[PDB]
Design a protein around this ligand. Structure first.
Ligand SMILES: [Mg+2]
Ligand SMILES: [Mg+2]
Ligand SMILES: [Zn+2]
Lengths: 158, 39, 83, 227, 1112, 104, 94, 158
DNA sequence: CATCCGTGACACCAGG
DNA sequence: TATAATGGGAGCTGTCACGGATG
């Protein structure tokens, strides 16, 4: 068992699902130019499209692992429970996925690069928003959990 | 912790508090630790 | 009556447990006015005094148990078996 | 800098002619596995034993056929023959053919093999086959001397047209486990403690097997002498 | 070796001077190299001009100041625990208004600390670093009201502690309210005090619906300015007699006094730009010709009404915008403290000016410098931003100097900062690093300045962009603020260019941070480099584009913690920034001019320059840093060598030939090893210790004082009572350990005797004296001994005495002695290693070389990293770094792969093919074929789909090698690892967290005064804390007796702990405990609160826990 | 006797004077020269107890044989110094003052 | 795991009574120099020194093995405390 | 530091820690043997590191025989943050923690530290050995599911 | 029967 | 110990929930 860069196998299907997505992108763009879809409706449709695309590429990565490389290190570690979940494996082999602004609002432009392919400066910066948000949320959450535990202990100690 | 009836003298309340509080830092669409505290 | 965990803990009978949690001055003044006697029922009250907690090996249900070998047990049964 | 090395005490712990634990401590750092691994390889590959290598059963064409009058198939009989622990009392003997003819309601054991001069069947109570009313079993098995393990399709020895080759389980040793634990002698801190565990079939004992192993290894060490 | 460089981006401008935020700011604050008449009204000059003149009678005006030379150099200050400072004189003149007598004098105002060459200070001998502070820029803002949607708050903010916040609000009743010092009152009153008549307000604000009628109050226009002025003074001063010259004074000091109220020059500019007006000074109004004239209030109210109505061109303000948040550098903070000290000095001046001689008063007799001195000494010694300098390695110091804190005086109180202050705002692009920040409570509150970023004169952070006109990218570089940046479409620095022209039909760009695909006709600017988005530490992470930001954060922060090793190496894979980091941090020593190297020594380098001069460069050798790491320079030239200007002459700490060398290039295999690298633990090879890899020098300072006592003098002596010659072996004649000795825990470093107290001998003592016939000596051994778990080789002894020239200690101290102990720390089990991608781990096992996995040619690997650390952490960069490191292992070359523009997989595979040829054709020529174990591993790899079935062994081994994998042999068995393993060179550092400093234990020791509980901390030989949650653990277990031990026998049951120690040393079982002392302390501290606490029995009869000792 | 309960109650002025071993009349702590506790101050040995075990202030009595004895020359009892952790003093106010706990 | 810990948990109605019993028995062994042990010479727990095997000095290991033998009686109100103390001092002096 | 050779009920305790932690026991046992005349002489002998000889370590081995120490890791979120272990004296300065208990402590080996506590009395030692020993607390008090269970490399190899 | 306001509380170990 | 002197002066900028006051 080892980890080399060629073990984050990018599936053949990915490119398809990207093009297949871009196509379905313009069908939502035209519907906005002719008043069919409003602004928020177009935003929601784009986000749903990209969520389903992410699901499809995750399934593609894992089906490729199961069928062609059943002893792939990432796949074995994930399946056994030794390390990793599907979403991390997807970020390593498939695409990074949708990213969130500081306002929580999701970017319409998803990071299409996996960590094997390497992100662009703009993709990395866009992802730093959510990374920082999660870190600050964890930091503020541990203290509330501690206060809660102390209250529970004091109310149940006898 | 022993898969058998509790022993008398167990200090059940402290175990309850620690059992509830220990996963507190894992509670992350849902409602989360704020919902737990609100309850 | 339904209370949250904080108010339920602060409304407990033992004032050593309540003052050690929060609102120390309020708990202490209301307990001093009323001349509260803490009966040391819980674990916090006993920890504050350094007493053996009423739980585990400190439970009255088990802490008075005695152990004696059959040699000494029969050497004592003879004593009573005499007087 | 200056070192002193007490000669290690060798300790044996046997249970019959089938199993033994062998403890050698203390050993300088690393020599636990340095001694254990070669001995394990040798004990699993080069200790001389015997093995069933070919079986002819009358009126049986191939290995996956069934037999009328017998409940087991030929495969089960070949497995039971693989478990036959045969011992050669004479060091010159190299191969024997064992005859076995029985019928009627009976459960053949390893006893029923006709005795051959200087061939001790260590496990006569080993079950072979059961026959019924009208069951007939005429078979000859071939027992060769050898080492290690040779699949049937690697020797393929056939005395006649319907002699089925059997995977030759030569090795008298069935398992070798060993484990090195850290040990201390005073303020020597990283010394090693070797623990061998040898399972045999009774033809050779674990202590005998280990001595043959160390002898083979020393004789191989002697091969660095004459350029 | 050759250094092959990847990357296609051309760096138009280099990185600016990295410590310029410190050096330039302090230079501008001092203006020491500027002749007095040419000084600008900024810095301490502006503080002087603000304070002076001092009136009321007499007048004391300010002419000029001057800063003399430091009384001692920097090294001498470091040794004598002094401060690197310059004397501060100010020429002042006294004037009597009536007499006309003018007396002039140059008064001495104490000393001011000077900034060293690298941008740090020396405060009482310790190097310190003033950290820049980010805060909300002064000005006029408009924010949405949270309760009422259609309403908005107008906030007016001056500099911190330079005036009150003002709020303007449209109340639910319609009137426009103003909040000042927490007082809501109708704004119409103040508008009337300014001289605004209903004519002007009606013609100015009537256009905005019915809002102007909320400003129409008849009882306010009925009175003239003076009556409304006194009305507002009564509304703001309940009780204070509303005198006329009191109300005018208060209003002037609150709204128009430049010496009390002050927007920044930035606040001035932003008010002018936002409200579309022009300001005269830095206040909200003026006192002109006797009356108050408005400056800001009417424009602010106009904008607020226009925002509430909906007039186009009026939007709310993003207060997280880096165009509304500015930096306060060292100069501004030190200047504020200087201003405070000057105000106190002026108060004292007026005090002495009211009751004196009225004729016999010189400036010297009027100026007490002390209030100023203190105000400076307090800033550099006890400010939240005057931090102990982190000089673990040069990069740590540089990073510390480039920090940005939201905390500090006038900053956020922690536990009160929300998400907004901590968020990565879109305007952080190019200005503030989005990666380097602490994990924990301070997340998002301590940040780092980006690499190309600069702080302008007003305090806003600016980032550079190239100008693009008609698809042609110029070399004109413009530094923008965020507000300026929001005007343009800015393309990405990786857009393809055919030399100066945008060569892509569609280019990626930003519009107000928003990503957009535009045409080259729309591109107005372009980025300079990817480097400009991240800090310096993050910029040192190769393959950063492949690491998740969460581990990039750790890899960034941990370079700060790398220990300078005696054999430090630059990374095999660099980012192209390892040189500027050494140069700007003043780590290495470079050549001033072209010339020939005359002399090369272990302590100095003498160079003859083209001017014929003979310049000697001394080398700092084995000096102790703030963190004890050794900071020594080593000569890298030789006698007779020709050198050009800027050529390296001496490598500093953590520098290899001028490259940043924070660690070692080790040969790693990525595989599990028998659980010894379970959960981030690391397995290393003993060879690393044999060739002294990961070996560091550390120096510790020990200090003792002999002082005068009421009971006789303490004297540092060799004549220590009751000690053998073995105990005094390495002590010199004066009692101080000799240089060169080897000191272990328990050894004496400095002998000292102290007189005992009364010490009335208990009868046991007297009888023992008589039995042994030896007088009890008058003094006792109080020598300085080596603490537990410390020691090394004495390298220095310093001794200062009272009565010695140039020496004067604090009162009472007869003498001070310091001993420097140096130790050479090898890597040991429990020391912490890490790479640059956030892979950290403690060394859990050091195997002998013969147990290490080895290559087929017998080369053992150095480090064994567990693969399970990669997938969950998503830091594949270290994987790529390994692959490239493999090629460079056999080609014998290092690499430069800049971030986001560097080595791609196909080029790495080209290099790997060349490396495999070097690695395998050698063997094919030396007369060896492919090994049997190699054949078995190839069979397994064929099963894994890693190599094509049918090719020759060499072809398949080459395919594996191109995947970065090699055959590996188990050193314990000689059999191969069943699969091919990733093996390659990786850059790994030894962090500052070494177990040698952390292992601690205690049976018994010192106890606290009031609580009688064990002290805390290794340095105090303290006990671990058994807090509330550990008590909860024991309770939940039911360990009643273990818990009672923790609460009584082990902490503060005095009788209990004494009896327990005596029982244990006697072989007896420990006694039942008694009442812990801290409960008695609680009872007595409650009695002190007039509360009777009574321990009772079950019969409700009092129980005496004090054993009658407190009952009369 | 075993402790079983802990009562807390308000303390009367008479109770507080019952606790006190002597009124603290002076704001002085220790003498600036001898570094010994001043008379009638916040650290007076006459009130709170001896600094040294079984030794009065002046030094006329310095052994355990004297126990409970109050020196006639300096007024310091001969007991264990531990009592300086246990012995209350008091301050008699010229005007009564409200206990802020029971006010705010 | 303590040898025979499942059986010891089977011997009591509360896991903490087992601990009280074991600790009291260990103190009994420590006070009387182990002279009241119910273990035969072969059942004595042993400790490997540099010279050779010696008696295990851990009174708790002893008490648990004694409990495992069945030769011990535990319960509440078996004998007055000072009566037990004096009888054990008579049979086994200190 | 991980010790994978430990048994579930053991930890690795450095010699220099265990000496100080058990120091009164060590003085008593040093007096029992010939290592020192009395307790005071034994303490003076242990004062300096160069005065310590191998008989001291061999007597420390006998001092700790059968005893357990408590290991704690902050934060102590539940009762399994403290567990009892038979200490195995090791060279070096790092505590050796059993792999299967890591999850319960939430401990990895990227720099973590743990506190050690010596239960003194026979009663405390019996509590620690019966109730708080690691090998007796195998199931979670919270859900009852196994808490000490195969993890990472164990699962990987199996 | 609402709004406003003053006063509580806001994780652990380590070193500091 | 004697001319007359007669009302201060900073402040510097959380986040929520809860119980009591007021309006
Ligand atoms: Mg070993
Ligand atoms: Mg950790
Ligand atoms: Zn006296």
């Amino acid at each position: 068992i080892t980890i080399g860069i060629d073990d984050a196998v990018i599936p053949e299907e990915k490119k398809q699902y990207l093009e297949e997505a871009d196509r379905k992108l313009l069908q939502i763009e035209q519907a906005y130019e002719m008043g069919f879809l409003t602004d928020r409706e177009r935003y929601d449709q784009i986000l749903q499209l990209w969520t389903e695309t992410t699901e499809k590429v995750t399934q593609a990565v894992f089906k490729n692992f199961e069928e062609n490389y059943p002893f792939n290190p990432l796949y074995v570690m994930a399946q056994s429970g030794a390390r990793g979940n599907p979403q991390q494996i997807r970020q390593l082999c498939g695409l990074r996925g949708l990213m969130q602004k500081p306002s929580g609002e999701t970017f319409e432009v998803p990071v299409r690069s996996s960590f094997r392919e390497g992100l662009t400066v703009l993709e990395y910066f866009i992802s730093s928003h959510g990374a920082r948000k999660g870190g600050a949320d964890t930091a503020l959450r541990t203290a509330d959990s501690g206060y809660l535990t102390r209250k529970l202990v004091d109310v149940t100690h006898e | 912790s022993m898969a058998r009836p509790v022993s008398i003298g167990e200090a059940v309340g402290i175990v309850a508090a620690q059992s509830i509080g220990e996963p507190g830092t894992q509670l992350t669409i849902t409602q989360g630790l704020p919902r737990v505290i609100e309850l | 009556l339904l209370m949250g965990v904080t108010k339920s803990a602060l409304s407990t009978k033992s004032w050593l447990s309540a003052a050690s949690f929060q609102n120390t001055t309020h708990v202490l003044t209301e307990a001093a006015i009323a001349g509260k006697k803490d009966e040391l029922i819980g674990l916090k009250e006993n920890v504050i005094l350094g007493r053996l907690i009423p739980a585990g090996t400190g439970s009255d249900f088990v802490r008075f148990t005695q152990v004696v070998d059959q040699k000494t047990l029969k050497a004592i049964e003879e004593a009573r078996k005499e007087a | 800098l200056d070192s002193k090395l007490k000669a290690p005490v060798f300790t044996v712990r046997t249970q019959g002619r089938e199993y033994g634990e062998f403890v050698l401590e203390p050993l300088e750092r690393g020599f636990g596995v340095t001694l254990g691994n070669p001995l394990r390889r040798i004990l699993l590959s080069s200790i001389p034993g015997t093995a069933v290598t070919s079986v002819y059963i009358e009126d049986v064409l191939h290995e996956f056929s069934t037999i009328p009058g017998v409940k087991e198939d030929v495969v089960e009989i070949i497995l039971n023959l693989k478990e036959l622990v045969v011992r050669f009392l004479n060091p010159s003997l190299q191969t024997v053919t064992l005859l076995l003819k029985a019928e009627g309601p009976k459960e053949v054991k390893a006893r029923d093999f006709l005795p051959v001069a200087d061939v001790e069947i260590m496990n006569p109570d080993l079950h072979i086959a059961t026959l019924e009313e009208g069951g007939r079993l005429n078979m000859e098995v071939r027992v060769d001397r050898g080492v290690g393990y040779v699949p049937a399709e690697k020797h393929g020895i056939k005395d006649r047209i319907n002699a089925i080759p059997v995977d030759a389980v030569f090795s008298p040793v069935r398992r070798v486990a060993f484990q090195v634990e850290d040990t201390r002698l005073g303020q020597r801190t990283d010394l090693d403690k070797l623990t061998l565990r040898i399972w045999t079939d009774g033809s050779v004992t674990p202590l005998e097997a280990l001595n043959q192993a160390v002898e083979i290894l020393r004789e191989h060490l002697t091969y660095f002498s004459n350029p | 070796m050759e250094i092959k460089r990847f990357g296609r981006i051309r760096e138009v401008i280099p990185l600016p001077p990295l410590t310029e935020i410190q050096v330039e700011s302090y230079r501008r604050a001092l203006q020491a190299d500027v002749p007095p008449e040419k000084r600008e009204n900024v810095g301490i000059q502006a503080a002087f001009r603000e304070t002076f003149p001092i009136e009321e009678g007499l007048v004391l005006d300010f002419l000029e100041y001057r800063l003399g030379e430091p009384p001692f150099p920097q090294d001498e200050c470091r040794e004598k625990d002094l401060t690197y400072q310059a004397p501060l004189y100010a020429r002042l003149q006294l004037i009597h208004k009536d007499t006309g007598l003018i007396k002039e004098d140059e008064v001495f105002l104490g000393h001011i600390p000077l900034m060293t060459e690298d941008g740090s200070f020396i405060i009482n001998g310790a190097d310190r670093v003033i950290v820049s502070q980010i805060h909300r820029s002064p000005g006029v803002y408009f924010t949405p009201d949270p309760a009422r949607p259609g309403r908005y708050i107008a906030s007016i903010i001056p500099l911190p502690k330079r005036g009150p916040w003002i709020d303007l609000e449209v109340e639910p009743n319609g009137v426009v309210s103003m909040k000042v010092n927490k007082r809501k009152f109708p704004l119409v009153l103040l508008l009337r005090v300014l001289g605004y008549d209903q004519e002007t307000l009606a013609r100015e604000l009537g256009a905005y619906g019915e809002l102007v009628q909320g400003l129409m109050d008849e009882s306010v226009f009925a009175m003239r300015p003076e009556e409304a002025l006194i009305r507002l003074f009564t509304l703001l001063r309940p009780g204070d007699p509303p005198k006329r010259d009191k109300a005018v004074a208060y209003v002037y000091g609150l709204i128009a006094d430049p010496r009390r109220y002050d927007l920044g020059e930035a606040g001035r500019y932003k008010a002018e730009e936002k409200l579309g007006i022009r300001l005269s000074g830095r206040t909200l109004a003026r006192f002109e010709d006797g009356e108050f004239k408005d400056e800001v209030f009417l424009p602010t109210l106009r904008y607020l009404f226009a925002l509430t109505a909906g007039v186009p061109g009026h939007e709310v303000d993003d207060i997280d915008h880096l165009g509304n948040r500015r930096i306060r550098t060292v100069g501004e903070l030190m200047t504020d403290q200087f201003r405070v000290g000057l105000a106190r000095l002026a108060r004292g001046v007026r005090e002495r000016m009211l009751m004196g001689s009225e004729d016999s008063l010189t400036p010297a007799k009027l100026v007490n410098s002390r209030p100023l001195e203190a105000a400076i000494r307090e800033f550099f010694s006890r400010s939240q931003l005057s931090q102990f300098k982190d000089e673990t390695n040069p990069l740590s110091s540089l990073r510390h100097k480039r920090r940005i804190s939201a905390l500090g005086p006038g900053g956020l109180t922690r536990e009160r900062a929300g998400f907004d202050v901590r968020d990565v705002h879109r305007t952080h692009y190019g200005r503030i690093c989005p990666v380097e920040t602490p994990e924990g409570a301070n997340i998002g509150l301590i940040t780092s300045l980006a690499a190309y970023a600069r702080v302008d004169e007003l305090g806003f952070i600016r980032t550079p962009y190239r100008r693009v006109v008609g698809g042609v990218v110029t070399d004109e570089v413009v530094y923008m603020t965020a507000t300026e940046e929001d005007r343009y479409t800015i393309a990405q620095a990786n857009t393809p260019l055919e030399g100066n022209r945008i060569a892509a039909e569609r280019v990626v760009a930003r519009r107000k941070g928003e990503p957009v695909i535009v045409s080259p006709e729309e591109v107005e600017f372009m980025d300079v480099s990817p480097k400009q988005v991240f800090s310096v530490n993050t910029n040192l992470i190769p393959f950063l584009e492949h690491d998740d930001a969460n581990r990039a954060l750790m890899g960034s922060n941990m370079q700060t913690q790398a220990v300078p090793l005696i054999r430090a190496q630059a990374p095999v894979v660099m980012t192209g920034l390892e040189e500027r980091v050494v140069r700007d941090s003043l780590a290495a020593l470079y050549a001033e001019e072209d010339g020939e190297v005359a002399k090369v020594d272990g302590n100095r380098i003498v160079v003859r320059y083209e001017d014929g001069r003979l310049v000697e460069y001394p080398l700092r050798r084995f000096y102790r840093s703030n963190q004890g790491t050794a900071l020594d320079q080593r000569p890298r030239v030789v006698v007779g060598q020709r050198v050009r200007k800027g050529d390296l002459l001496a490598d500093g700490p953590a520098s290899e030939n001028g490259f940043l060398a924070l660690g070692q290039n080790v040969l790693v295999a990525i595989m599990p090893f028998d659980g010894y690298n379970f959960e981030d633990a690391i397995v290393i090879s003993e060879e690393l210790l044999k060739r002294d890899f990961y070996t560091s020098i550390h120096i510790e300072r020990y200090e003792i004082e002999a002082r005068d006592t009421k009971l006789g003098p303490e004297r540092i002596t060799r004549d220590i009572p009751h000690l053998s010659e073995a105990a005094l072996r390495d002590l010199d004649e004066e009692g101080v350990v000799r240089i060169g000795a080897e000191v272990k825990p328990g050894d004496i470093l400095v002998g000292r005797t102290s007189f005992k107290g009364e010490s009335e001998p208990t009868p046991e003592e007297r009888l023992l004296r008589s039995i042994f016939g030896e007088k009890a000596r008058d003094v006792k051994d109080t020598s300085l001994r080596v603490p537990p778990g410390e020691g090394g080789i004495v390298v220095r002894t310093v001794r200062l005495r009272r009565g010695d020239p140039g020496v004067e200690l604090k009162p009472g101290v007869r003498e001070v002695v310091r001993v420097y102990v140096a130790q050479k720390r090898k890597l040991q089990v429990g020391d912490k290693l890490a790479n640059r991608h956030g892979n950290k781990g403690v060394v859990a096992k050091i195997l002998p070389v013969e147990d290490m996995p080895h290559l087929p040619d017998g080369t053992p690997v150095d480090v064994i990293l567990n693969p399970l650390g990669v997938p969950s952490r998503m830091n594949l960069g270290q994987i790529l770094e390994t692959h490239l490191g493999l090629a460079g292992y056999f080609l014998g070359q290092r690499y430069i792969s800049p971030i986001f523009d560097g080595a791609k997989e196909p080029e790495i595979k080209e290099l790997l093919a060349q490396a495999f040829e070097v690695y395998f054709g050698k063997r094919k020529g030396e007369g060896f074929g492919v090994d049997k174990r190699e054949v078995e591993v190839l069979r397994r790899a064929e099963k894994l789909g890693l190599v094509t079935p049918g090719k020759t062994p060499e072809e398949q081994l080459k395919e594996l090698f191109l995947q970065g994998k090699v055959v590996l042999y188990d050193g314990r068995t000689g059999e191969p690892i069943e699969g091919p393993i990733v093996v390659g060179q990786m850059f790994i550092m030894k962090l500052y967290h070494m177990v040698e400093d952390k292992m601690h234990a205690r049976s018994t020791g010192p106890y606290s005064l009031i609580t009688q509980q064990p002290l805390g901390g290794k340095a105090q030989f303290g006990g671990q804390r058994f807090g509330e949650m550990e008590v909860w653990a024991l309770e939940a277990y039911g360990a009643a007796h273990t818990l009672q031990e923790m609460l009584t026998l082990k902490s503060d049951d005095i009788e209990g702990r004494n009896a327990a120690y005596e029982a244990i040393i006697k072989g007896e079982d420990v006694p039942e405990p008694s009442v812990p002392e801290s409960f008695r302390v609680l009872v007595k501290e409650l009695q002190a609160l007039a509360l009777d606490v009574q321990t009772l029995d079950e019969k409700d009869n009092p129980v005496d826990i004090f054993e009658g000792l407190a009952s009369k | 006797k075993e402790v079983r309960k802990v009562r807390i109650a308000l303390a009367s002025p008479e109770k507080i004077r019952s606790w006190s071993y002597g009124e603290v009349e002076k704001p002085e702590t220790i003498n600036y020269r001898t570094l010994k506790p001043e008379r009638d101050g916040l650290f007076d040995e006459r009130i709170f107890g001896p600094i040294k075990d079984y030794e009065c202030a002046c030094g006329k009595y310095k052994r355990q044989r004297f126990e409970g004895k109050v020196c006639e020359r300096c007024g310091v009892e001969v007991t264990k110094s531990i009592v300086r952790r246990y012995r209350m003093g008091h301050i008699e106010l010229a005007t009564p003052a409200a206990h802020i706990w029971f006010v705010k | 795991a303590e040898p025979g810990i499942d059986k010891l948990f089977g011997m009591v109605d509360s896991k903490y009574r087992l601990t009280v019993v074991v600790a009291k028995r260990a103190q009994q062994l420590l006070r009387h120099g182990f002279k009241n042990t119910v273990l035969e010479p072969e059942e004595r727990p042993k400790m490997q020194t540099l010279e050779g095997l010696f008696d295990d000095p851990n009174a708790v290991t002893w008490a648990m093995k004694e409990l495992l033998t069945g030769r011990l009686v535990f319960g509440e109100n078996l004998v007055p405390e000072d009566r037990l103390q004096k009888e054990m001092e008579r049979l086994y002096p200190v | 530091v991980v010790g994978p050779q430990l048994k579930l009920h053991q930890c690795g305790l450095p010699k220099r820690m265990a000496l100080e932690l058990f120091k009164p026991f060590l003085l008593k046992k040093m007096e029992e043997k010939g290592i020192a005349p009395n307790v005071k002489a034994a303490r003076r002998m242990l004062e300096r590191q160069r005065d310590i000889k191998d008989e001291v370590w061999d007597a420390l081995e006998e001092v700790i025989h059968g005893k357990v120490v408590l290991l704690n890791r902050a934060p102590t979120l539940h009762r399994l943050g403290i567990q009892a272990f038979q200490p195995v004296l090791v060279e070096g300065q790092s505590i050796q923690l059993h792999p299967l208990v890591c999850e319960a402590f939430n401990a990895d080996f990227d720099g973590d530290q743990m506190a050690v506590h010596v239960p003194l009395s026979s009663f405390a030692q019996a509590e620690a050995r019966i109730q708080m020993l690691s090998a007796h607390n195998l199931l979670s008090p919270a859900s009852g599911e196994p808490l000490a269970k195969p993890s990472r490399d164990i699962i990987l190899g199996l």
